[PDB]
Design a binder for this molecule. Structure first.
Ligand SMILES: [Zn+2]
Length: 263
């Protein structure tokens, strides 16, 4: 069974600039673009786990998407952490890919929000966080997460606590994680790197972000702060991609460099 649902897709306008600002200063994203949209959505969830339900849908531009939601009500600001995290990961991977130090390219799935609406008057408009809260409230429903559909064999390559998948080792992914800490001057590290490998491409989903500021990602269960950063580096070996990038090492690193895998 399926029905039509109409409402607003909610994204962040000028992502790069917003994210650059969020990282550098300490100011949360306060600008959200609303775009009217109609989805065809399955009534029955095809999967659940990691604390949340998943529904197949078609975005009417015909693309296959997945609508996700936590089991019960959550405040907008909690859900926005997932979005802010994903946007950081996309920002970082885009720069990382632009370095062209590896044939393998990293692509985190876009994540946005969807709320149903009978009306379309906010179409194309940019709203503050508070105005977005009011648009959400008017619906009186928890927004859904939306992400493109991803098929293939899903692998967890690195977790958020120093664990490394051995058989499916990719030096590109490990160097990326180290690099995220270097690029953000020690402030955060991206891990829980997991998704699908095909054609020199990693399609990555549900990452974790450790931040040294105890007030930055307060709802995230996967953010272990400075300890999670230390945990990554205790088992990290700088690889040929790290070396080619001349990444400075974390003072917890003790293991010797390795040159298995890419480059
Ligand atoms: Zn390294």
């Amino acid at each position: 069974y399926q029905t039509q649902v109409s409402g607003y897709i909610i994204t962040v306008p000028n992502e790069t600039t917003q994210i650059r600002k969020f990282l550098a200063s300490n100011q949360r994203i306060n600008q959200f673009l609303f775009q009217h949209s109609t989805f065809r959505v399955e009534l029955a969830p095809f999967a659940k786990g990691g604390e949340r339900l998943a529904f197949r849908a078609i975005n009417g531009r015909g693309d296959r998407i997945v609508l996700k939601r936590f089991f019960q009500q959550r405040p907008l600001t909690m859900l926005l952490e997932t979005i802010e995290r994903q946007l950081i990961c996309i920002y970082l991977a885009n720069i990382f890919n632009k370095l062209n130090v590896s044939p393998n390219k990293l692509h985190f799935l876009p994540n946005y929000l969807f709320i149903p609406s009978p009306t379309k008057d906010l179409d194309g408009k940019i709203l503050t966080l508070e105005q977005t809260e009011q648009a959400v409230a008017a619906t009186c429903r928890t927004p859904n997460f939306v992400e493109p559909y991803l098929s293939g064999y899903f692998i967890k390559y690195i977790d958020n606590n120093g664990w490394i998948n051995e058989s499916e080792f990719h030096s590109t992914l490990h160097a990326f994680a180290h690099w995220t800490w270097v690029h953000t001057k020690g402030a955060l590290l991206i891990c829980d790197i997991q998704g699908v490998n095909a054609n020199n491409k990693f399609y990555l989903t549900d990452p974790a972000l450790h931040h040294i500021d105890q007030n930055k990602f307060i709802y995230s269960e996967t953010n272990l702060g400075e300890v999670g950063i230390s945990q990554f580096f205790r088992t990290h070996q700088c690889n040929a991609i790290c070396q080619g990038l001349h990444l400075p090492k974390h003072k917890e690193q003790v293991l010797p460099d390795t040159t298995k895998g890419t480059t």
